């Protein structure tokens, strides 16, 4: 079919920043996570390396994708597919050439795929404030992120879904630990501390004569992987403007729905969640200035000069959003 053909053509850009992820979601019948993960696993030769049966991978991916909510505007399967593909590009940065093992690459990609699974479209603070069952289960700490991990790992136990069946016990244990460490680091409450430690690493940075990073112990390696997936999660403002604007419309819809629930329950409405007192453009400039730019500038310093084009796009988009404010 022409549709299958156009999908294949779009997937040829899987190694590029700015992949048309929304078009892929449309052309695949709302299966961007499955088709992008499959494409990346084939590109990196991960099925052969880890002896993953192809039918098992597709079965797991479709099941995982089914556990992202189709009625959540932002934290859905499209976001998951986007974070996966963004991580995949960051792993190919010349400064990280041959730095991570195949197991570490597998961990970072799998963590990205599951990192928001079963997201209900409300924040950790909302779940805590409403005395939710999730906040009760997880003692108010990294409530969503613990849940995303539990669901992502539990789904491996469904029929023909154990993609790690042929890993050794030691490999399985190492991969599990890494995935947990990465997904827990996507909790925004940990952003300031992650960034501070990234800055410390940049200052004491050790590289070869070609600028390839030298990371020997687990502490430094996992820290770079955590910040990599965190950067991917917070990559929307560094993408081509047309994509960024669609991501902004989606998060604003999700936020406004949370604010509607807060308003009716008599709760104070969270920042950016009040559709009657919103300033979307000012919020984007604030988000870039206080969170996204500080993070990406630091990442760019770590892999200098490989992330220059990403930082340039971020600055271009900040300038555009600022121009929309009278």
Ligand X SMILES: CCOC(=O)c1c(C)nn(-c2ccc(OC)cc2)c1C
Q: Which residues are annotated as a binding site for AMP?
A: 75, 116, 233, 236, 284, 287
Binding region: 75, 79, 115-116, 233, 236, 284, 287
Structure tokens that stand for 247 in this block: 């991501």
Binding region for 3',5'-cyclic AMP: 75, 284, 287
CB of 48 vs Zn ion, minimal distance in Å: 30
- Which residue in the list 75, 88, 119, 147 is annotated as catalytic? 75
Binding mask 192-231 for ligand X (x = CB under 6 A): ----------------------------------------
Q: Is 75 a catalytic residue?
A: yes
Q: How far apart are CA 314 and CA 288, in angstroms?
A: 8
Binding mask 89-118 for Zn ion (x = CB under 5 A): ---------------------------x--
CB of 21 vs Mg ion, minimal distance in Å: 17
Helix runs in the chain, H state only: 2-11, 21-27, 32-43, 46-49, 54-66, 77-91, 102-114, 124-129, 133-137, 143-154, 169-184, 191-203, 218-233, 241-265, 280-287, 293-302, 308-323
Q: By C-beta, is 39 or 226 nearer to ligand X?
A: 226
Binding mask 235-254 for ligand X (x = CB under 6 A): -x----------xx--x---
Q: How far apart are CA 148 and CA 116, in angstroms?
A: 5
Q: By C-beta, is 83 or 310 nearer to Zn ion?
A: 83
For the chain, the first-to-last Cα distance in angstroms comes to: 48
CB of 316 vs ligand X, minimal distance in Å: 15
With vertex at residue 180, the alpha carbon angle to CA 111 and CA 18, rounded to the nearest 5 degrees, is 25
Residues 91-110 that bind Mg ion (CB under 5 A): none
For 100, phi then psi, to 5°, come to -95, 145
In total, the chain counts a number of residues equal to: 326
Binding mask 14-53 for Mg ion (x = CB under 5 A): ----------------------------------------
> By rule CB under 5 A, what count of residues binds Zn ion?
2
Rg, the chain, Cα only:
20
With vertex at residue 13, the alpha carbon angle to CA 8 and CA 15, rounded to the nearest 5 degrees, is 125
Report the residue from 145, 162, 233, 254 that binds Zn ion according to the rule CB under 5 A: 233
Note whether 243 and 236 are within 8 A (CB). yes
Residues serving a catalytic function are 75
Contact residues for ligand X (CB under 6 A)?
A: 188, 236, 247-248, 251, 287
């Amino acid at each position: 079919t022409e549709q299958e053909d156009v999908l294949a053509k779009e997937l040829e850009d899987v190694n590029k920043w700015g992949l048309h992820v929304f078009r892929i979601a449309e052309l695949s019948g709302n299966r961007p996570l499955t088709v992008i993960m499959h494409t990346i696993f084939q590109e990196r030769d991960l099925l052969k390396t880890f002896k993953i049966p192809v039918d098992t991978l597709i079965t797991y991916l479709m099941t995982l994708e089914d556990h992202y909510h189709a009625d959540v505007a932002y934290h859905n399967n499209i976001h998951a597919a986007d974070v996966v593909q963004s991580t995949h590009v960051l792993l190919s940065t010349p400064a990280l050439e041959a730095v991570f093992t195949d197991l570490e690459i597998l961990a970072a990609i799998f963590a990205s795929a599951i990192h928001d699974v079963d997201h209900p479209g409300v924040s950790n603070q909302f779940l805590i404030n409403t005395n939710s069952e999730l906040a009760l289960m997880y003692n108010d700490s990294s409530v969503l992120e613990n849940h995303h991990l539990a669901v992502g790992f539990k789904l491996l136990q469904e029929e023909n879904c154990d993609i790690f069946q042929n890993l050794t016990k030691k490999q399985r244990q190492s991969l599990r630990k890494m995935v947990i460490d990465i997904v827990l680091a996507t909790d925004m409450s940990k952003h300031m501390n992650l960034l501070a430690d990234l800055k410390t690493m940049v200052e004491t940075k050790k590289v070869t004569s070609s600028g390839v990073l030298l990371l020997d112990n687990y502490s430094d390696r996992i820290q770079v992987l955590q910040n990599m997936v965190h950067c991917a999660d917070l990559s929307n403002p560094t993408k081509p403007l047309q994509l960024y604007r669609q991501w902004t419309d989606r998060i604003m819809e999700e936020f406004f729905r949370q604010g509607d629930r807060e308003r009716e329950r008599g709760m104070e409405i969270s920042p950016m969640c009040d559709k009657h007192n919103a300033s979307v453009e000012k919020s984007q400039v604030g988000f870039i200035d206080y969170i996204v730019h500080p993070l990406w500038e630091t990442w760019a310093d770590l892999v200098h000069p490989d992330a220059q084009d990403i930082l340039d796009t971020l600055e271009d988009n900040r300038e555009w959003y600022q121009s929309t404010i009278p």
